[PDB]
């Protein structure tokens, strides 16, 4: 992970 | 990074890539455009890496379900076949190559489980799941069993579980409702209950996996197994006199195997989209194009009507197509990972008694729907 979202 | 004025194609090394190269030579003789067919290892996990940076092949062949992910990342060109071309392929195959309502790949071939049976033990295979227990007792009186198939993977057990109404994600209008999971509805409970009763009553063994079943069938120990076209050559080798037919019905409804559609997608970064469309539509997706690939390595059932009708003189292929048409296209969405994980656990747990059918499916439903409800991290 380490990136966020949400998709 | 992608060379203009030629076509690079990636296809799994277990496919008829040499035959595909022959189709390319025909393309090159007609247009002077060179077609290179490669079969990189793990090509389908390499494609999204390289295509993201604007590199990779012009055309990638893989099972349709992987293409959902590529499309999500904007890695695939939207294709533009006209209505006349679309009418050349079975409609449901087009359903397999739609993402967000858009067509993002050309369907080529179709795979699905069928009922495979020993003609010597069983010249008249059962039309229904319900008659299999009685058949098992009769066969076992002579020390053969009715049916062995892989029970460890939802892929193999789902057709029965789904027959009376189970589903992974609701398919709506070329889109999946990721919040609509059909894992714990009465249809799935019925199917799973019947499956678990078969195991509980020793008509099947909870431990049976792919190798055990294959071994038993190919040795003539069991009258029936459930497998796909990829298994046929092993049976050819065994000299068992086998047939391939429609899956039994359950509660009057067809078994619903997942369907895999080998599809050809166009790199969004390709400068040769027109060449690829021309190659795919007018060279590969013709009787002669598919036959050239098929001769190298059998495709199985195909999406192209005219050629499927020829191949369907082989009743094993006709049966594959029939099961496919009755089946469930495999959803091409990332949320499928949560479905497989959850159902795999639910079936294991239910067949081993560790959970009741009702509780296993409830938890699976909850877990599959939860992991589908969000994305990121
Ligand atoms: C991030 O999401 C995880 C999964 O739900 C949580 O377990 C974790 O606690 C969450 N971390 C935080 O809430 C810090 C969030 C910082 C902002 C993240 C979102 C923005 C849009 C990048
Ligand atoms: C994250 O996704 C959820 C839906 O899955 C949505 O409710 C929420 O607004 C999103 N948050 C973002 C994109 O920051
Ligand atoms: C979730 O998946 C999307 C796919 O496009 C990524 O872009 C995103 O960064 C995250 O990995
Ligand atoms: C992304 As959050 C758990 O701070 O709402
Ligand atoms: C909308 As959320 C990422 O706080 O569950
Ligand atoms: Zn290779
Ligand atoms: Zn797949
Ligand atoms: Zn046309
Ligand atoms: Zn019984
Ligand atoms: Zn819905
Ligand atoms: Zn496959
Ligand atoms: Zn020919
Ligand atoms: Zn529970």
Swiss-Prot record, chain B:
Induction: Induced by maltose and the transcriptional regulator MalT. Permanently repressed by cold shock in a PNPase-dependent fashion. One of its GO terms (biological process) is maltose transport. CDD domains: PBP2_MBP (cd13656). Pfam families: SBP_bac_1. GO terms for molecular function: carbohydrate transmembrane transporter activity; maltose binding. Keywords: Periplasm, Signal, Sugar transport, Transport. It comes from the Bacteria. It is found in: Periplasm. Its main location: periplasm. GO terms for cellular component: ATP-binding cassette (ABC) transporter complex; ATP-binding cassette (ABC) transporter complex, substrate-binding subunit-containing; maltose transport complex; membrane; outer membrane-bounded periplasmic space; periplasmic space. InterPro entries: Maltose/Cyclodextrin-bd, SBP, SBP_1_CS. Part of the ABC transporter complex MalEFGK involved in maltose/maltodextrin import. Binds maltose and higher maltodextrins such as maltotriose. The complex is composed of two ATP-binding proteins (MalK), two transmembrane proteins (MalG and MalF) and a solute-binding protein (MalE). Belongs to the bacterial solute-binding protein 1 family. This is Maltose/maltodextrin-binding periplasmic protein. It comes from Escherichia coli (strain K12).
């Amino acid at each position: 992970x380490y990136x966020x979202x949400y998709x | 990074k992608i060379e203009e004025g030629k076509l690079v194609i990636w296809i799994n090394g277990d496919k008829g890539y040499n035959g595909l190269a022959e189709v390319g030579k025909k393309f090159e003789k007609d247009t002077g455009i060179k077609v290179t067919v490669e079969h990189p290892d793990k090509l389908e996990e390499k494609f999204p890496q390289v295509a993201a940076t604007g590199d990779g092949p012009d055309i990638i062949f893989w099972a349709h379900d992987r293409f959902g992910g590529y499309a999500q990342s904007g890695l695939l060109a939207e294709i533009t076949p006209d209505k006349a071309f679309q009418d050349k392929l079975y409609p449901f195959t087009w359903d397999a190559v739609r993402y967000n309502g858009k067509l993002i790949a050309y369907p080529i071939a179709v795979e699905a489980l069928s009922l495979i049976y020993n003609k010597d033990l069983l010249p008249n295979p059962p039309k229904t799941w319900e008659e299999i227990p009685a058949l098992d007792k009769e066969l076992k009186a002579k020390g053969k069993s009715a049916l062995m198939f892989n029970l460890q993977e939802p892929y193999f057990t789902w057709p029965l579980i789904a027959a009376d109404g189970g589903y992974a994600f609701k398919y709506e209008n070329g889109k999946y409702d990721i919040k609509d999971v059909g894992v714990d509805n009465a249809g799935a409970k019925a199917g799973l209950t019947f499956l678990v009763d078969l195991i509980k009553n020793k008509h099947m063994n909870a431990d049976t996996d792919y190798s055990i079943a294959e071994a038993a069938f190919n040795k003539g120990e069991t009258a029936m197994t459930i497998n796909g076209p990829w298994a046929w050559s092993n049976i050819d080798t065994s000299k068992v006199n086998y047939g391939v037919t429609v899956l039994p019905t359950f509660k009057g409804q067809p078994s619903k195997p997942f369907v895999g559609v080998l599809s050809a997608g166009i790199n969004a970064a390709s400068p040769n989209k027109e060449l690829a469309k021309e190659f795919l539509e007018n060279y590969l997706l013709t009787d002669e194009g598919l036959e050239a690939v098929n001769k190298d390595k059998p495709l199985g059932a195909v999406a192209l009507k005219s050629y499927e009708e020829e191949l369907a003189k082989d009743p094993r292929i006709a049966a594959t197509m029939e099961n496919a048409q009755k089946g469930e296209i495999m959803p091409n969405i990332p949320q499928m990972s949560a479905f497989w994980y959850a159902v795999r656990t639910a079936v294991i747990n239910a067949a081993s008694g560790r959970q009741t059918v009702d509780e296993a499916l409830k938890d699976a439903q909850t877990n599959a729907a939860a992991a589908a409800g969000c994305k990121x991290x």
